[model samples]
Target chain A: MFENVSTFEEAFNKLLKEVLEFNLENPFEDAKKVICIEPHPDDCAIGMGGTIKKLSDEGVEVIYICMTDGYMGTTDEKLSGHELALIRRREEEESAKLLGVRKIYWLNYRDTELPYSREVRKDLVKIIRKEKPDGVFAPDPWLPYESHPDHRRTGFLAIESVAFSQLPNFSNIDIDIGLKPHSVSFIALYYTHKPNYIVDITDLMELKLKAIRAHRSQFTDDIWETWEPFLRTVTMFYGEKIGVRYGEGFRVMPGLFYHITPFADLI
Target chain B: MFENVSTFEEAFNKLLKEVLEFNLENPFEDAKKVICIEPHPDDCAIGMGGTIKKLSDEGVEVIYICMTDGYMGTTDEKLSGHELALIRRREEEESAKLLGVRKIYWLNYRDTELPYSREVRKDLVKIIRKEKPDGVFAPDPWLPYESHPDHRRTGFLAIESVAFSQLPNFSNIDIDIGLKPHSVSFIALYYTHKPNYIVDITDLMELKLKAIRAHRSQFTDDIWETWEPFLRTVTMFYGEKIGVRYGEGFRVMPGLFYHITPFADLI
Candidate 1:
C-alpha cells in the first residue's frame, strides 16, 4: 500500500499499518506486583499517590523505590544534609505506609548527583530482578525541560534497567550477585509531557491528599497552602478528559487497552 | 530549621531552593547542527520558524524532521490521501527552504496514528546518531490536553531516542545495521503548556509568517487569513514577559543559560 511513497515516508507508514493491525491488550490487569521508582522521597506521592492507593487496595503488592536522599532539596541554610535526609526518609516511609506499600527500598543515592550510568542501572536491575514486578512506574524521563537532575536520571535509569534486567547476559556482575533476568510488561510514566492514559482518581482523591500530607519535611506551611489548590487544578485538568471529577494521567509505553475506542476516552 | 514548619511547606521550600541553585547552562553553544522534529508539516513553521531562521543565519546548520504526511488534516474529502501527502511534502520542502533549513527528513507517519513504539524509537535514534546534534527541538509531549496522537508520540519518542541513542548497547539491531551511538545536550520544546524560556522573535516575525504560509495544503484560505492576526496576538502574549514585540516560547530541558538572572527572565 505504501509502494509509491518516498523512503522516509514509506517506513513510517509501514509502522503505522502494523499498529493498526496489532491487537490491543491491558498489561496492568495481569500485574499482581508493581514497583514505583521515585527520584525523591515525595515524588511518587505527588505524581501517582491515588493510583498507588487504588492498586494496593486491589490486592496488588506495591513497592516504593526512593532513589535519592534528597539532602540538597532544602533552602534553609541551618539544616545540614544529614538532618534533611533523615527527615525526608521518614516522610517517605510515612507516606508509603499510608498508601499501603509493601516495603520501601531506600537506595539513598546523593540528591542532584544521580547519574545515568551502568553502575546506577545495575542497582535498579537488581531490584527489578528481585521484585519481578509486572508493572513499573516512574517519572517520565523524557519530560521536556525537567530541570531536576535527579528526576531525569532516576527515570532514565529505571526504564533502562527494566529493559536490561530482562536480558540474561546484559549484566554479568548482576548475575554474579545472584540477580536473575526479569522483564516488566508495562511502564506507566507519571509527570508525563503528554498522557495517553487517565486513571479516574475521583474516589481516592481525599486519601491521595492525605498521603501527600505525610511528607511533612518537604512541604512547609507556605508550600502546603498552595499545593492543595495547585494539585486540585491539575487533577481537574486531566479529569475533564475522561469525564471524571479527579484523575491522574500517565503515558503508558507499549500501549494499553481501555475498552472504549482509542482516542475517544484518553488523549 | 524546619521544626516549626508544616511538612507540606517545608518540602516545597526545599525543591524551590534547589531549583534556584541550579546554574543554567546553554547546550546550544556547542551545537554545530540541530534538528527540529515536528508532528505535522507546518508545526515547525508555526512554532519555531523565527528561531530556526535566526539559528541558520548565525551559521548553525538546522534540519527539519517532519513526522507526518498530515493527509487526514484536510476538511475537503475530494482530495485523495495520496494527493494530499504529495502536496504537504512539497509544502514542507518549500517552508524548510524558506527557513534556511539544511535538509528535511520527512517521515510520513499517518496523520493522527503515530504510535509510541520501539520501531519508532529506532528510527529517531538513527537520526540522532547520524546528526549528533547538540540541540534538538520538538513539541512539548507533556502539554496537558494535547489530543493529537502524532504530536504526543513524536515528542515522546524524540526525547526517548535522544537518551537511548547515547547508549552503546541501546539498539543492537540498529547498530548491526550501521547506526552508531550518540547524544544531544539539550532539547528545546515548543507548544509547552508552561514555558520557562521566551525568545524575542520580533526581528524575524514577518519571515516566520511567510514560512508558515508556505504550507498551503494544511492552512487553507480561511486559515491563512486568520493566522497573521492570531499569531501576532499569541506572540504578544509571550512577548510581554521579555519586553519584546514578538516572541516564541520554549521549555528548554537540561537547561539553557540565559544572560539574564535565572528564573527572573523566564517562568
Candidate 2:
C-alpha cells in the first residue's frame, strides 16, 4: 500500500497543504454615502454603533434617520401616543447628536404602527432624494420569526421606498420640496429573514456601548448595569462564528451595479 | 387620588414641552478619514459595513486594508490557502466596488501566526502615512472569552500601530517608500470585553448581509443560510433593547485629540 505512491498519511498532509494554499478569498470593500434608517431612537446606536464608528473612522459619511420617537420605550409615562411621540422626538435628536451622525431626520411616526402610509413612504422618499445616498439601511421586513409588527412593516416600507425612488412617475413631498428622484444603489436590511452580507464590527464594540449609554433616560443606571454585560456577551458569541476575535454581521443587497472591492487594493 | 398634583403635572408638562421644543443639534463636525485595518479578508466588512455605508453615504471616503492573505480559511484540496487568498482578494474587490470603496490595501502577512514584528508595524505605518486617516478600525486584543491567536495578536499589533503612527521617532519604512506621518483621530476596537459605543445598524442591516455574502467562500451557502437567521435574531434582540427594528454594536477609543462625531453630524 505504501509503495503504490504515497501513504494515506502523506496524502492527507498533501491535501491539507493544498487546501491551505488555495484561497477562496473574501473581496469585500467599503461603500459611499451610507444612510442608516432606524425605526426608533436607540435603533441606530445599538444595532450598528460599532459598525458606524468603524465606517466613520474610514471616512464614510454616516447618516442616521429614525422613523419614530421612542416615547413608547418607557412605560412609566402614561402619555398618549402623540405625546409620547413628541418626547421620543426630542430624545431622538439628543441621541443622534451623540452618535456622530451627519444628520438625523425624524419621521415622527406612531410607534408599533409604522403604517406603510403614503405619508411615510413619501417622507422616506424625501430623505432618499435629499440624501441621494448610495445605499440605505433599514429594518428587514421578512424576519421569519419576527413578532413585532412595527419591525416587519418598517422593513417592507423601507425596501419599498428604495424601489419607489427609482420610478420617475412616483411622486412624493420631496418633488415639491425641490428634491430629485434618487434610486438608492442598494438596501441594507437589519433584522431580516434572509441576509446576503455580514459586517465584522469587532473594532467599534466600545462605541456601540457609548452610543447606547447616551440614551440615559431609557437605560437608567440600574438597567444598564445588568444589560451592558449581557450585550457584550452576545457580541462576543457572534464573533466566534466568524473566526474573528469579534464581529458584527450584516445582510447586503447589491444595487444595479454594485462591485466588490479587493482586500489588497488601497484607496 | 392624584388630583392634588394636577397643577404640578400641568406645570411640569409645560416646562418639559419648552425643553422639548429645542432644535436638533449634532456635535461631530468636519471630515475625518478613518482606516479599517484587519488581519484577514472580510474582517472590515463584518466589523463595520453598516457604519461604513452610513459614513460613505455622507461623502466620507472609506479605506479598507487587510493584513493577511487568509490562506487558512479553507481545507479543500482544489482550493489551497494561497489560492484561496487570491480568490478572496478578488471577491473583496467585487464587494468593495458595490460599496463604493475609496481604496484597499493588502499586507500579505501569514495567516494564523500574525507576528507583531517591527517589519509588519512598519508596513502598517507606511499605509497609515500614505492614507493619513483620521481614525482607525482595529480589533480588540481582549475579547472577554474567545481565542483565535491570529485575531488576538493582530488586535494587539493594531493597537500598537495606532500608538506608533503618532510617534515621530517611529521609523517609517515608507520614508524610502514615500510615506509620511499622519495622526489618527480615534480607534474602534472590535470584540472588546468592554465596549464604548453602540451603532444602530437597523438601517444598514441588509447592506451588511450583502457585504458578508460577498465572502461566499468563508460563509458557504449552507452556513450562510443557517447563520443569517441566527444573526438576524441577535440583531432583533439588540434592536428590542435599543428600540430599533435591528442593530449592531461596538467599542470605540477616542484618540488623543480625536473629535467625537455627533450622532447627527457627519462629513
Candidate 3:
C-alpha cells in the first residue's frame, strides 16, 4: 500500500493528509472561556497558575475541574485520609480564589487511582456540554518519564472527552440527560516535556508562587524554599526563548484537529 | 541596603527593577536580514534547516558563518586533513545553496580546537559589522550536558561578538580595518537544552533532512537510515506541544539585553 513512498518526508506527509486531514483554523480568538482539569488538588495551579491569572485579568471566564480528592498527597500520620481530603479541597479553593478563578467542580475520586473508563469520559463530556468552554487545559499524558498513574489517566481521559464530547452518538446517556454536544477550540497541555508556546509570566510570577505555596500540607519548609528557586530556574530557562525574564510553557493544540501534522499551531 | 528583601521574588524584582532595568521590545519583527553561525560545516543545517528554508522563502537574506574547516569529523584515517577540509567546504556550499542562503563566510579554524580568544572575537565582530544583520543564530553555550569543546567555544564567541559589536570602543582593530559598529537585535539559539519557541517544520522537514544528509563523508548508510527516524522522533516530541508531527525548537534572546537578573534573557 505504501510502495511509492521512498523518503521520510513523503511518508509523513501522506500519513498526515490521510489521518489528520490538516486544515488551518484560528483557535485562540474564540477562547473567551476556558476550563482547566486537574487529577489532584494542586496540579492545575502548579501547571498554569500564571496563565490562569493572565486569562482572568483579560476577562476570560475560567473554571477548574478537580478530578481527585487528593487523599494521599500528604505524609501526616496524624491526619486520616478523609481529613486530608477536606484540607486539600480547602487549599485548592483558596488557591483558585487567589488566581481569580470563577468556579471549581470536584469529582471527589480517590487520589492516585483515576481510571480511564467510559464512566469518567461521560462525566467529563457532560461537564464539557454544560460549560461549553472554548479552551481546555490539562496535564500532558505524553510527557516523557511521567510515572504518576493519576496524571496519566486524567490527561488521557481529558483528551478523549474533548474528541467524544463533539459527537452526538458517542455518549447517548449524556444526550438523554439533556446535555448538548459541543466542541472546544483548543487544548493546552501543561507539564509538557517539549513546549511550543511560551507565555511570559514575569509580571505574574509572584501570584503563581503564592498559589503554589497554598498547598502547605503537601510540602515541607525545605521543599517550599527550594521549589520557589527551582520553578524560577525552569521558567527562566523557557523565558530565554521569548526574551523574557520568566515564562510558562505549553503544548497547545486545536481541539478539533487530529494532531498528526508535521507543523504545530499552524493557524 | 538589601536587609528588607526576604523572599526570592522580592530580591529578584528589586534586582530586575533597580540593577537590571527591565524593558521590553520585539526583535524578530525588526530582523530583515540575518546570519547563522556554525561551529562546523553542517551544524547550522542540522540544527535549523527548516527555519533557514522558511526564512529564505520569506525573502529574508541569510548568511552562513562556518567557524571550522571540519577536518577531524571522520574516521577515515586514509584521507589527508587537507583533502577532508576541501571536501567539507564543497559539501557546505552545496548544502547552503539548497537552502537558498545568500552567502557563506568561512573562518576555517582547526576542527576540535577552536579557541575562545581575542583574535576569534575580533574576527566575528568584523563579520557582524560588515553584515549588519538584525538577527543572528548560533549554538547555545549553556545547553546542558554539551561536551563538545568546539561547540562551546564557538557559541561563547558568537555571544561575545553580539555584545561587543555595537560598542565603538570594543574591537578597535576591526574599526581600524574600516568596519563600522553594528548591533544585532536578537540571537536565536539552536540545539538548546530548554527551548521556549517551537517552529513548525512539517512542511520543510524533508529539505532539512536532505541538507543534513549532504555531509556524505560523516554519515554511513546505517547512520543515515537511523538519523531520519531519530530526527523525526525528536521533532515529533517537540511538535506535541503545538499539536504538530514535526517541529524545530529554539532558545532566542535579545542581543543587547543585560545578562543579569535571576532569570536569563531579561531585557
Candidate 4:
C-alpha cells in the first residue's frame, strides 16, 4: 500500500485493480453459449433478457434455466399441484422458445422449499460443468439483510458453483458427466441492490416487457392490477437515476475483463 | 347556455359529478382487509410497504401479492424453470413476512407472459374473493411504453378484475366457491410513464430495502456487490422528483380510498 510513486498513480492503479476485479474479461470475445440461472421464471427476462436478446441477435447462443418448479401458483381449480407443475413446465418451455433460448430445464422443487443443501450445490455444479458458459448472470445474495431463504440459498449456490466449477473433484456430479473443471470469464447479477454498473435499457426495455408479458397467469389477478401504475412510475424514477431513459442495474463480479475499446464503452 | 351560478360553482358541480360517478357505490366504508399486488417483489414494498407495515402494526389486515416468479433471470448455470418459479415464490413470501403482511401469494407465471385471458382474470377473481380486500394496488399500464410485461399485465388484470368483480355470473370459479362480489373501494396504481400522484416514502424507503433484501438469491451475488450504491443514488433521484429527500410515485385510480386521508393529509 505504501509503494505507490504518486497519489494519482495510486488512484489509477486502484481503479485498474477494481476493473480487473470485476472480471468482465472481454466483451468482444466471441462466446458460443451463455447460460442464465434464474431463480424464477421472470427474473432473467427482467434482469438480462434484453442483453441476452442483444447478444443472441449478435450470434451468441443463450439458454435459460429456472431453479424451482412453481407449484404454489396453482390458481387453476382443475389442476392439482402435480398438474400445475406440469402446466408451469409447459409454460416455461413456451417462454424459453419465445425468448429464442436454446434449452430450458425445470427442476421440480417444492415452492418455498429451497435449502442450502449439498444436493442443491451438486445440482448447480452439474449444470455449470455442462454449459461452461463464458459469462454467468445470477441474483446477488448480499442484499441488506435479505430475508428470503431460497433467494439466499440460490445466490449462495450460484456463487459457489463458480468456484466449484474450477476445483477438481468438487463434486461427483461433474465426474459422472465426463466434464472437466470450467471457470467462467464473466459474471453479471441482476436486481442488484448494490449495482456498480447499469445497462442503458432504453432500447432493450421494450424487449424486456415483451418477454415478461409472455407470462399471463400471474398478471390476471386484481391485487396486482391495482399496483401496476405505481410500479411503472418507479421504473421511470430509477431509469432517470442513471441519466438513461430506461435501464437495469447489475453488480459485476471481480476478476472479469470488460471490453473497453473506447472511453464511451465505460458507460 | 350559462347558468346563474358562479363559474367556480359550475366547475365544482361538474367535478363533483365526476367524483360521484367514480364513487357510485363505495365498499371501503367498513372494509377490514387490504391487499396490494405488485408486478415485481420490490414494487409494493417501496410504494406502500410502510403503510402496509403501519397498518399491520395497528392490527389492520394487509396482504401482499407478487405476480411473477422471476424465472427469466440470467445466471451462470442451468436451473429448471419450475424450480426457479418456486424459488421466487419463497422469496416473495419472505418479503411479505418481513413486511408483516397477513398473507403472501406468488403467482408462478412465466416471465413476460402477460395478456388478458379468461384464466388470468378468473385467478384474480379468486384472490379477490379469498382476500375480500377493500383496497387493491397495481401499476399504471399507460406508462410510456416501458418494456416490462409483468408491469403491463398486472395493470391490465387489475383494472379488468375491478370491472368484472361485480358480475358474479361472469366467472364460474367464483360461483363454485360461493364467493360474493367484492367491490374494492380503494385502487392505487403506481404511475410508470405518467403520474397523477406521489407518495412520500421517506421513512418507508428503509422498509422498501428490507423487503427488497428478501430476494437474497437475486441480489446477493458478486455481480450485485457494486449495484447497491447506484440504487441508493436512484432513490435520491426519485426523492428530488417529488421535492423530497426520497419518495415513490403513483397514479391514483379515480375511485379509491388513498392512504393519505383528508385534504390536509400530506407531507
DockQ of each: 0.03, 0.01, 0.01, 0.03
Candidate 1 Cα RMSD (Å): 15.7
Best of the two (1, 2) by lDDT? 1
Stronger candidate by DockQ (2 vs 4): 4
> What are the per-residue Cα lDDT tens digits for candidate 1 across B66-98?
887888878887998889989888888889899
Residues A166-224, model 3: lDDT tens digits: 65555656666788778787877888866778888999899998898998887668787
Model 3 interface CAPRI class = incorrect
lDDT of each residue in A1-267, candidate 2, tens digit only: 111222323422332233223111321234577788887778777766766777676776888778876656766657676676666666656655555576877776767767655457777877887888876787755556877777766765676677667544355245556776776655666654344445677766776777777676678888998989877875665567667665555555323111111111111
In order, the Cα lDDT scores of the candidates are 0.74, 0.63, 0.77, 0.61
lDDT tens readout by residue for model 4, A66-91 = 78765545344554556556766666
TM-score of 4: 0.48
Task: Give residue B77's lDDT in candidate 3 (0 to 100).
Answer: 34
RMSD of 4: 17.3
Off by over 4 Å in 1: A1-267, B1-27, B255-267
Docking class for model 2 is incorrect
lDDT tens per residue, model 3, B5-102: 88977876786568655333332555589999999989888888888998888888999999988876654435656788899988888889889986
1 or 4, greater by TM-score: 1
Regions more than 4 Å wrong, model 2: A1-267, B1-29, B172-178, B237-241, B254-267
Give the least accurate 10-residue stretch of model 2 chain A, judged by summed lDDT.
A257-266
